Design a binder for this molecule. Structure first.
Ligand SMILES: CCCCCCCCCCCCCCCCCC(=O)OC[C@H](COP(=O)([O-])OCC[N+](C)(C)C)OC(=O)CCCCCCCCCCCCCCCCC
Ligand SMILES: CCCCCCCCCCCCCCCCCC(=O)OC[C@H](COP(=O)([O-])OCC[N+](C)(C)C)OC(=O)CCCCCCCCCCCCCCCCC
Ligand SMILES: CCCCCCCCCCCCCCCCCC(=O)OC[C@H](COP(=O)([O-])OCC[N+](C)(C)C)OC(=O)CCCCCCCCCCCCCCCCC
Ligand SMILES: CCCCCCCCCCCCCCCCCC(=O)OC[C@H](COP(=O)([O-])OCC[N+](C)(C)C)OC(=O)CCCCCCCCCCCCCCCCC
Ligand SMILES: CCCCCCCCCCCCCCCCCC(=O)OC[C@H](COP(=O)([O-])OCC[N+](C)(C)C)OC(=O)CCCCCCCCCCCCCCCCC
Ligand SMILES: CCCCCCCCCCCCCCCCCC(=O)OC[C@H](COP(=O)([O-])OCC[N+](C)(C)C)OC(=O)CCCCCCCCCCCCCCCCC
Ligand SMILES: CCCCCCCCCCCCCCCCCC(=O)OC[C@H](COP(=O)([O-])OCC[N+](C)(C)C)OC(=O)CCCCCCCCCCCCCCCCC
Ligand SMILES: CCCCCCCCCCCCCCCCCC(=O)OC[C@H](COP(=O)([O-])OCC[N+](C)(C)C)OC(=O)CCCCCCCCCCCCCCCCC
Ligand SMILES: CCCCCCCCCCCCCCCCCC(=O)OC[C@H](COP(=O)([O-])OCC[N+](C)(C)C)OC(=O)CCCCCCCCCCCCCCCCC
Ligand SMILES: CCCCCCCCCCCCCCCCCC(=O)OC[C@H](COP(=O)([O-])OCC[N+](C)(C)C)OC(=O)CCCCCCCCCCCCCCCCC
Ligand SMILES: CCCCCCCCCCCCCCCCCC(=O)OC[C@H](COP(=O)([O-])OCC[N+](C)(C)C)OC(=O)CCCCCCCCCCCCCCCCC
Ligand SMILES: CCCCCCCCCCC
Ligand SMILES: CCCCCCCCCCC
Ligand SMILES: CCCCCCCCCCC
Ligand SMILES: CCCCCCCCCCC
Lengths: 43, 322, 38, 49, 40, 321, 49, 38, 40, 40
């Protein structure tokens, strides 16, 4: 695709957002971005 | 070909798990570290198994200064990502077409260095197990394979004995002919399944022999011997022998090791809380008169109220399990 | 012999003797005595 | 030659003592914690009957 | 030169084919063990 | 000398203990080590106080590999010996003529090295303290003193304020004339005795100021500032450190921050009545390195009475109080 | 300059986190042991009556 | 300015400010909140 | 006695051990005096 | 250079004598401060 040809040297930084989104779409609580990224017991 | 079910052979393990009980359970090579370490991890789900992690380290050459991770795993998928403080990204993706057929992809991308890749296909049949993988594949102009390809086969010849072999093929530059190498494998498990013998006869002249034994319900023991042959125009054989034991209880795990080169080592994990444990490892090299110390901690949290209560043990409304 | 001690057969025999002595010790009931009843 | 044998014996006793200390102190702590847990469970069993 | 590459390639191809034959014999072997054990 | 008894002054302590509470109780400079360590003590008496010790160590430059020690101490005598591996022998001998007049000897004899000696006379009056100390004395054939000689004086001028001074005289070579230096001291203890200030004006241009405070019955705190003067053109070298100590019934904690970027901690946990486990760790944020030490201490006894007493069950009798 | 402002904040967060962990974990263990001793002695005093 | 940062007076002023702020923190009631009641 | 000056400092720790040993009611032997083990 | 050493020795002797003088003044200090506090 054109997007894959335009961005190839920075396309590997979107892998960990994809794993975070895949985990987030299966949770019943569905926490926010800072709750996903923080190590504290956010609940 | 009609009395295979009359023979009633079971599937052996994988070639990767040939000496798992000695190498990765009793011995402390996979657990030893140096310096100070802190690993904080959080769990958001349990049946689709979503987790994140933070790692802090100082005083070691292997571990990064900081790393962030995330993993997701349902019954036929496993995804993982990881990024360091030098902005190196690692990925992983296992997909199981069945419970006997798994395809694995493993990438590693860092700036200023070439991209590392690794592909693998695993197949576990009713009484044998095949595994073919490929480390750093590439192709030339004419269409010649470059990099190293490994294939292995393991067969149960009797309900306790297993025999196998493993082939290798490495062609580094692509303007030279490739190499080859064949190993030979053996694994014998006792009838009571209380002791396991495993031996290898590798392609690079090595020879590894191992013995595991379950002494009590809390104590295991092991011994491993490695002999490696080489050249200086003269023969040269380098040998080693390690012996160890593991004691496991409800609140602590202990591992201790002796070596024929004058090294003694210990590793202790001490669970001072249901969500907090303290690690210690120490070594003394009596041949060179020096030591290594590591101290760390592990902290487990949760991302919702049900998981918080379950990992505390209080369960629903302060009523524990039964 | 000290000339035998320079050979690779010395290291081979030493590690083989260590392996068979350790296997005999592990399968002996001394290793059962090393596990406390608690 | 007697002093050399004494030197070897002292240098061997040092290695045996420090090996025994490093291998045996954390195992002793682990066994001590297990015994205290069993004793606390026995007191809970005495309270529960 | 070039003539030593053919010997190396022939030897490595021979090694790979020998490994394949040993794997086939290993797959056959449980029935052979059963036949020998039932005969004796 | 008529109204001093109406003034009602007290003894101001010693010059050596001027900042004892900050420097040797709250801070962890005397306790920090690196590597692995083990101390095995053994007591034979309590009122005449006879003890032995064995020390094992690996991974540090300060500690020796092995050391054996023995000490004896009654109400007016104190003897101590110590031998390491490599045969370095050290000795110590105090003797109190009165309860306030002590003579001290201190020798250290190692092979291939000159003998080190140190003599000291300590005197504590009703409201002042004197201390004369000679480090490595020598005399030539002509009769010239060679070595270091220190004399101190500390006077209580108020029930809370103490002032004093310290004089040094060092003549190393014996041919060139020696040099002298004068320090000035100050110690102020509060009226409720919950905070203490100490200050020094050293002969090397240095300036040390300290403050101690007892926050609760288990918590103490401290802060110390050092300014050094050097000629590298004048240069000033300085550090400021702050710390706290938490004492409980079976654990002592010490933790320290520093203005050069270092943090450190020290923990001693008494896992048994006769066994302790020590941990110390340091992180230097300016240089990105670390130090770790782990050890243990074991105390035993040499007779049944002391063995039962340190276990806590005094024979058939109850522990009681 | 924006990324130069971000990198120093990341390093500052790393230093604050590791300083707080090293200074705070052993003090937390000490306070936990004291709380368990107080609870055990209170249960003994309740068993006395 | 930047000329004052390389002067020897900067170390003296910085350590004096550190000592005064630390003494004021230690004698404050903020130090009493760091002592647990147990 | 003035020619044994070089090895006279090895008798200081036996003197402290004897001074302690003469004041104990138990009066243990030499090997028990030098043994770390509890050993009453 | 012997006349250079006499200035150094005179200076160190003067320093020691000045230290003795301020020690004597420190000993007589509490009565002086008591008189000042009582008069003031
Ligand atoms: C409370 C703790 C919260 C988590 C602390 C995060 C620490 C980050 C450390 C760091 O960035 O290191 C600098 C480093 C740069 O280090 P460097 O490369 O300058 O150091 C080189 C190493 N030495 C010194 C040894 C030569 O940056 C990174 O690690 C890159 C970013 C990684 C991705 C971070 C994503 C997660 C962010 C979590 C935010 C949490 C917010 C919660 C509210
Ligand atoms: C980019 C890296 C830049 C820094 C390193 C420069 C070197 C590059 C090396 C190179 O190109 O080697 C070619 C390598 C093979 O070569 P190599 O790296 O094995 O060896 C050659 C190296 N040199 C030339 C230096 C000798 O190609 C690959 O393996 C694939 C390259 C791309 C892989 C990364 C992107 C894959 C697709 C990501 C999809 C993510 C999906 C997310 C979800 C979407 C929605 C579902
Ligand atoms: C530790 C000690 C145990 C290590 C494990 C050794 C046993 C493993 C057995 C593997 C399964 C059987 C392999 C087999 O048939 O070996 C034949 C293979 C090859 O035998 P071969 O008969 O195929 O070789 C001659 C064939 N021609 C005539 C064509 C050249 O190896 C052996 O002979 C046994 C192993 C030694 C390999 C030395 C090279
Ligand atoms: C220490 C290294 C060594 O082997 O000693 C040589 C050396 C001999 O000394 P050396 O005189 O050769 O000098 C070696 C150099 N230094 C002094 C720096 C160590 O060590 C000893 O002093 C003897 C150590 C006794 C224990 C030896 C350990 C080997 C294996 C023993 C059993 C362990 C398990 C066996 C089964 C598995
Ligand atoms: C050692 C000292 C004690 C010896 C002994 O008999 O112990 C039994 C003792 C029990 O016997 P005991 O010594 O208490 O005496 C018996 C007590 N009475 C008389 C009252 C019945 O302890 C144990 O059961 C466990 C000892 C474990 C020793 C360390 C094991 C090795 C740890 C590191 C592994 C290294 C690899 C080597 C192993 C393979
Ligand atoms: C003490 C003694 O008798 O030996 C000192 C003698 C003195 O002999 P030495 O002075 O010739 O040996 C010293 C060795 N160097 C010079 C290398 C440091 O031997 C020793 O130093 C070693 C033995 C000390 C420990 C003796 C008991 C060991 C077993 C305990 C159980
Ligand atoms: C060098 C160290 C080597 C140590 C190796 C491990 C030894 C483990 C022994 C296990 C004994 C198990 C047992 O039966 O004990 C039950 C006994 C029970 O004693 P009890 O009967 O009084 O306690 C009551 C228990 N119930 C209620 C169940 C009846 O446990 C103990 O007494 C604990 C053992 C002592 C603790 C450890 C002492 C030695 C520590 C060594 C420090 C360094 C010394 C170096 C010089
Ligand atoms: C049961 C045991 C009962 C008897 C116990 C006897 C204990 C013997 C020790 C008594 C006092 C010995 C003083 C030795 C003086 C130091 C010396 O010679 O060097 C140390 C020497 C060291 O050897 P070295 O003197 O050759 O020095 C070599 C070291 N380098 C190279 C760095 C210089 O030996 C020892 O370490 C001996 C002590 C070992 C531990 C003994 C006590 C614990 C035993 C537990 C059981
Ligand atoms: C008052 C000051 C002393 C004046 C004496 C002057 C004498 C003289 O000429 O100078 C001698 C020495 C300098 O002379 P020297 O010894 O260098 O000259 C000797 C000549 N040669 C070297 C050529 C052989 O200096 C002293 O004054 C040293 C005083 C030492 C005091 C002795 C203390 C004895 C301790 C007894 C109790 C033991 C407890 C501790 C034991 C520890 C054991 C390890
Ligand atoms: C604040 C941190 C540093 C604290 C330094 C304390 C020094 C206090 C001065 C002191 O005790 O001197 C006694 C002082 C001595 O200091 P002084 O200032 O009289 O002596 C200096 C030398 N002459 C005589 C030339 C002026 O005692 C009294 O005289 C009063
Ligand atoms: C804040 C908090 O709750 O922490 C206090 C707790 C301990 O205090 P605490 O919460 O036990 O307080 C004592 C009990 N009460 C509430 C009755 C006064 O933890 C700390 O000390 C914080 C540092 C821990 C490690 C930090 C990692 C970064
Ligand atoms: C940066 C690692 C990406 C891994 C992707 C795996 C699936 C293709
Ligand atoms: C040659 C391998 C080891 C032989 C001995 C096995 C253990 C037998 C039982 C020992 C009591
Ligand atoms: C009585 C001899 C040992 C004690 C030392 C006294 C001298 C004091 C130090 C030198 C002035
Ligand atoms: C090397 C000194 C050991 C002790 C000697 C003193 C013995 C005193 C005996 C009193 C009669």
């Amino acid at each position: 695709s054109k997007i894959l040809t335009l961005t190839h040297n920075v396309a590997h930084y979107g892998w960990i957002p994809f794993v975070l989104y895949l985990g987030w779409a299966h949770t019943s609580n569905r926490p926010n971005f800072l709750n996903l990224l923080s190590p504290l017991p956010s609940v | 070909h009609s009395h295979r079910q009359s023979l009633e052979l079971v599937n052996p393990g994988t070639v990767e798990n040939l000496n798992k009980e000695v190498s990765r359970d009793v011995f402390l090579s996979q657990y030893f570290f140096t310096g100070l370490r802190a690993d904080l991890n959080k769990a958001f789900s349990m049946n689709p198994a979503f987790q994140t992690s933070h790692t802090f380290s100082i005083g070691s050459q292997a571990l990064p200064k900081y790393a962030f991770s995330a993993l997701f795993a349902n019954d036929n998928l496993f995804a993982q990502g990881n990024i360091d403080n030098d902005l190196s990204v690692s990925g992983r993706l296992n997909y199981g077409w069945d419970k006997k057929n798994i395809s694995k992809v493993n990438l590693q991308i860092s700036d200023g260095q070439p991209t590392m890749c690794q592909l693998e296909q695993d197949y576990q049949a009713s009484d044998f197990s095949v595994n073919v993988k490929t480390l750093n594949p590439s192709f030339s102009e004419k269409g010649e394979f470059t990099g190293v390809a490994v294939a292995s086969f393991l067969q149960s010849v009797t309900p306790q004995l297993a025999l196998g072999l493993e082939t290798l093929y490495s062609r580094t530059d692509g303007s030279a002919p490739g190499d080859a190498g064949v190993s030979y494998l053996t694994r014998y498990v006792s009838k009571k399944q209380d002791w396991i013998f495993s031996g290898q006869l590798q392609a690079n002249g090595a020879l590894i022999a191992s013995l595991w034994r379950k002494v009590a319900q809390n104590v295991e023991a092991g011994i491993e011997t490695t002999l490696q042959a080489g050249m200086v125009i003269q023969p040269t054989v380098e040998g080693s022998t390690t012996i160890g034991a593991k004691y496991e209880y409800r609140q602590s795990v202990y591992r201790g090791t002796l070596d024929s080169n004058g090294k003694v080592a210990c590793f202790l994990e001490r669970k001072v809380l249901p969500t907090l444990s303290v690690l210690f490892c120490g070594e003394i090299d009596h041949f060179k008169n020096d030591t290594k110390i590591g101290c760390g901690l592990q902290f487990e949290t949760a991302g919702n109220q049900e998981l918080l209560m379950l990992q505390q043990g209080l369960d629903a409304d302060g009523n524990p399990l039964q | 012999f000290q000339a035998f001690k320079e050979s690779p057969l010395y290291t081979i025999a030493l590690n083989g003797a260590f392996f068979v002595a350790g296997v005999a010790f592990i399968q002996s009931p001394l290793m059962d005595m090393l596990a406390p009843q608690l | 030659f007697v002093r050399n044998a004494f030197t070897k014996s002292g240098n061997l006793a040092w290695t045996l003592t420090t090996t025994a200390l490093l291998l045996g102190v954390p195992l002793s702590l682990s066994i001590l914690a297990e015994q205290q847990l069993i004793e606390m469970e026995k007191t809970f069993d005495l309270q529960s009957d | 030169s070039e003539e030593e590459k053919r010997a190396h390639q022939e030897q490595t191809e021979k090694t790979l084919k020998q490994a394949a034959y040993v794997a086939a014999f290993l797959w056959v072997s449980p029935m052979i063990w059963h036949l020998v054990k039932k005969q004796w």
